[PDB]
């Protein structure tokens with residue numbers, strides 16, 4: 001990558017100019033230059049480049065991605081002394097722990113909250129069920145009740161999880177990677193409510209992060225749903241806003257996934273010592289975290305000393321209230337499959353392209369059995385041969401990707417079938433969102449002709465396979 005310097009990747013919604021200021025100070029004292037970059041899809045790009053021995057020295061992301069990276073051998077083990085570990089909260093260290101090793105430095109606790117315009121709405125609704133009626137009133141005076149990012153499942157998940165949706169079942173000291181709670185009655189109820197909001201034109205299916213942000217920050221919508229990072233732009237807009245508890249659904253609290261912003265060190269980095277110095281002695285200090293937080297708020301920082309200093313903030317208090325009512329994300333490798341599954345399900349259900357029941361049923365299978373990798377002109381689909389959980393392995397001839405024109409290369413291992421497919425010939429459907437070009441197809445399992453009576457538990461499965469590329 002290059003010795004004698006530090007390249008850092010952090011997401012574009014985070015305080016990367018502030019992190020760059022911390023890097024400027026590092027360079028002053030040490031002479032080592034620090035380059036902070038915020039590439040798009042960095043959570044997907046990191047493992048691709050790190051596997052070739054390249055990529056940045058340090059990668060920032062929520063903790064949920066790091067178990068996959070660790071499992072893939074992409075991360076150096078971090079070795080802080082007890083004195084440094086004492087400075088941060090135990091819960092945050094827990095988040096960056098994988099298979100008995102610490103695999104990242106924890107930075108800050110994140111959770112979504114309800115953000116609301118006090119002038120347009122002095123009393124924000126305590127329940128989701130209120131919102132359609134509240135929207136009607138606001139529509140009368142040229143406004144909307146609620147706008148938030150409907151393109152990323154992170155933002156819709158709190159509602160889905162409220163009445164009993166979950167990611168993976170934690171049982172007997174581990175997560176069961178085949179027990180996915182995206183297709184239970186609680187999850188269906190949550191998504192159905194969301195899809196109804198769109199049906200009844202209280203929300204729009206195409207609404208994304210930037211649209212929702214512009215709407216609230218211009219005073220066009222009374223509420224939005226976002227994290228601490230979002231506050232800086234609202235402050236600049238001079239909108240009179242409050243950060244509060246997310247609305248309940250069917251009397252139960254919204255359950256946002258708690259994320260811990262984490263910093264991992266590339267296993268291929270020749271600057272592992274410099275990276276440790278930077279993170280421990282420059283970033284993870286009151287002065288370091290202040291520089292980043294000033295840029296874009298981090299939330300509840302992992303560093304005890306600075307967290308206590310900011311805890312008075314009622315916005316942070318609300319973040320932690322919502323964090324309390326939600327669940328911490330697993331960091332297991334299967335989380336990206338889970339996120340793909342839910343992202344796709346919500347988009348297809350919200351568009352009316354698929355039903356809520358059918359969408360979430362497919363999401364279960366995708367999360368449990370499927371991995372989608374989108375490359376330049378190419379697509380890789382890896383399917384678990386234990387497709388149902390029976391222990392009975394599917395045969396590759398019974399699996400089909402796309403239509404007859406789609407002629408992928410098919411490879412078989414003991415446990416998986418792998419499709420290497422050209423996107424042009426295998427795209428059943430293509431479409432454009434504001435931000436993306438979307439290529440879509442389907443994976444089918446159909447063991448026809450089957451040799452008996454078909455009793456139950458249909459062996460016919462079909463799941464959406466989809467790739468999204470930035471416009």
Ligand SMILES: OC[C@H]1O[C@H](O[C@H]2[C@H](O)[C@@H](O)[C@@H](O)O[C@@H]2CO)[C@H](O)[C@@H](O)[C@@H]1O
Pocket residue numbers: 011013043062063064065110152153154155227259339
């Ligand atoms: O939507 C799926 C996405 O959710 C999380 O990403 C969050 C992130 O944790 C926040 O810090 C902020 O940047 O918003 C992101 C959602 O757009 C998961 O951490 C991520 O793995 C997952 O893809």
Ligand SMILES: [Ca+2]
Pocket residue numbers: 040041042
């Ligand atoms: Ca992104």
Ligand SMILES: [Ca+2]
Pocket residue numbers: 179180181182183184364
């Ligand atoms: Ca299930």
Ligand SMILES: [Ca+2]
Pocket residue numbers: 232293294295296
């Ligand atoms: Ca700022």
